[PDB]
């Protein structure tokens, strides 16, 4: 069973050739399944399929992290690299421009803010 | 599938005419020619021109669709558009009389470098050294003409700068091999890194504008050659250890010779040929073993053909033969029933119209 962290400490070329080898093993196992295979081989089919998924996942994480680094501190980044919370949230006013105030309101709040007070009994 | 329409592949697909290339690239003809000069893009004639050009046989120039495709992603085209935008902004500033922003725009005038263009045009520096001769011929030709309104004085100054730097490099490296004196001028020949290069350097004379050439083509060729020549000299100085650009100021054939020159000889060529082989040169300020002087009336007194013949042959020539007032030896260029039956025995089998080639030539 391929361990995902051991995958993470390998190169893209090594991951690519391991993916091709894993695909070749999966092809041979499916050949056994159609020709009549044993329970051990049929059980190895699912493990090989999951290993291929793990290889493809690890490759994708490396590719997307490389894209994030390349597009770091850039004004425009790929749409899949941007936030996706909800469409409405994206359209909403940002906290900076929601807190923008006119010079009139700044002076009013500077000089006459809500005072903390209390009443004697 | 379907009946494929005729003319959808083959010559009609890979060859593209000049007008269609203009439309494809959205360039003017002037811009297209400039790109074709800067890059390596030349017309390529097909074997079946009628098939390539629809059905017509009128003379059209063909370019590879691959070459026209490659020019689509060239940054120089964008710089042409950016300069056109800049020029239009300058026209606005001058028209509205805003001299301050006119000076600001002139300072921020967009320029481009041929760093990339040289790289793909000459993949290796050996190739660049191979195709350098036309550049040297042009710059040495324009290094002597008077500066006019059409040509930039800066470009003229850069011509002599590049020419002087290369001549100094050859002198200090002793890379000169042959030198020919012809009516055209002086043809130098050098061998550096195994590459053979020959170029012509004309005399400085009071020429005149031919009034038939387009300096726009000269301008783009000059800027390309200056860009090419600058990096070539930069590689040469760095390879031999010196810094570039410098502050302008039989390898032992003439080593023990202190040549002195008179006021009638091409001192630019004489200094080059003598110092290329270690010879020391002295000259009159207005511009001793041997005194070069071609005047019929006046330190043995010799003539420049003696030096040039010595350069060509790698052997000291005859000073007495080349003495003043004596006939000059000619100057040589250093780089230069059965039969009848066979005549009518031409019954085919000689391929198609092939043997007459050799017979005629």
């Amino acid at each position: 069973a391929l361990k995902t962290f051991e995958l993470r400490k390998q190169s893209q070329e090594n991951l690519a050739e391991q993916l091709q080898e894993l695909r070749q093993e999966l092809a041979s196992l499916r050949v056994q399944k159609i020709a009549g295979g044993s329970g051990s081989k049929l059980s190895k089919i699912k493990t090989t399929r999951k290993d291929i998924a793990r290889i493809l996942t690890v490759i994708n994480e490396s590719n997307r992290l490389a894209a994030r680094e390349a597009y770091k501190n850039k004004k425009y980044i790929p749409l899949d690299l941007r936030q996706k919370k909800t469409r409405a949230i994206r359209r909403a006013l940002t906290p900076y421009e929601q807190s923008r105030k006119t010079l009139k309101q700044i002076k009013k709040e500077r000089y006459f803010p809500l005072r903390k007070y209390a009443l004697k009994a | 599938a379907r009946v494929k329409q005729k003319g959808k592949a083959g010559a009609a697909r890979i060859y593209i005419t000049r007008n269609q290339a203009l439309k494809k690239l959205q360039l003017t003809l002037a811009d297209f020619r400039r790109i074709c000069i800067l890059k390596g893009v030349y017309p390529r004639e097909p074997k079946n021109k009628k098939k390539a050009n629809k059905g017509s046989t009128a003379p059209v120039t063909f370019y590879y669709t691959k070459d026209i495709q490659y020019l689509l992603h060239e940054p120089i085209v964008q710089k042409f558009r950016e300069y056109k935008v800049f020029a239009r902004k300058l026209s606005k500033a001058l028209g509205k009389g805003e001299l301050e922003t006119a000076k600001r725009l002139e300072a921020r005038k967009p320029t481009y470098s041929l760093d990339h263009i040289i790289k793909e045009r000459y993949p290796t520096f050996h190739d660049a050294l191979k195709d350098i001769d036309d550049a040297l011929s042009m710059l040495f030709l324009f290094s002597t003409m008077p500066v006019t309104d059409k040509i930039g004085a800066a470009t003229v100054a850069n011509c002599e700068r590049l020419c002087a730097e290369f001549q100094h490099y050859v002198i200090r490296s002793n890379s000169l091999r042959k030198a020919f004196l012809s009516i055209k001028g002086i043809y130098y020949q050098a061998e550096i890194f195994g590459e053979q290069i020959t170029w012509i350097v004309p005399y400085k004379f009071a020429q005149s504008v031919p009034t038939d050439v387009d300096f726009r083509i000269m301008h783009t060729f000059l800027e390309f050659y200056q860009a090419l020549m600058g990096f070539v000299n930069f590689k040469l100085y760095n390879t031999l250890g010196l810094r570039y650009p410098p502050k302008i100021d039989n390898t032992s054939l003439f080593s023990n010779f202190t040549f002195f020159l008179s006021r009638e000889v091409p001192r630019f060529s004489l200094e080059f040929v003598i110092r290329a082989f270690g010879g020391k040169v002295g000259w009159d300020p207005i511009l001793i073993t041997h005194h070069i002087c071609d005047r019929p009336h006046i330190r043995i007194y010799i003539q420049p053909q003696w030096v040039y013949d010595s350069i060509n042959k790698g052997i000291l020539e005859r000073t007495d033969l080349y003495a003043c007032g004596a006939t000059l030896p000619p100057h040589l260029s250093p780089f230069v029933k059965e039969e009848k039956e066979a005549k009518e025995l031409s019954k085919m089998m000689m391929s198609n119209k092939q043997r007459k080639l050799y017979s005629k030539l």
Binding site: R23, Q24, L26, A27, S28, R30, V31, Q32, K33, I34, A35, N60, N63, R64, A67, R68, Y71, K74, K75, Y76, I77, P78, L79, D80, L81 | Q26, L72, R81
Partner: protein, 117 residues
């Protein structure tokens, strides 16, 4: 000076797309490669007879594989040159390919080397 009664709109410069970012962070891997083209060979009695008679292998093939992609996938997966490909979509909705091998190779050894006999 106009010699035509019609006014055609002038041609303007059409700049090509020069985006400030890529819409996709990473280009997708080829989604239909050789291993996804070939699923598994068919080993029915009719398939076996085609092996021994027509020198033709029979494969269960992806739906979106054409005759060109089947040929390259077979050449890359098995290093055998097919001379013809015939495809059908079986009544269960799966593509079946008859790969006729070249006269220099025999389908019997190819079948044993695959191991589905």
């Amino acid at each position: 000076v106009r010699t035509s009664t019609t006014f055609r709109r002038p041609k303007t410069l059409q700049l090509s797309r020069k985006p400030k970012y890529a819409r996709k962070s990473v280009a997708h891997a080829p989604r239909l490669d050789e291993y996804k083209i070939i699923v598994n060979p068919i080993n029915s009695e009719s398939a076996m007879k085609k092996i021994e008679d027509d020198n033709t292998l029979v494969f269960h093939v992806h739906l979106k594989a054409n005759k060109f992609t089947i040929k390259e996938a077979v050449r890359k997966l098995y290093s055998v040159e097919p001379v013809k490909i015939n495809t059908l979509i079986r009544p269960n909705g799966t593509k079946k390919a008859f790969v006729k091998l070249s006269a220099d190779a025999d389908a019997l050894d190819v079948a044993n080397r695959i191991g589905f006999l």
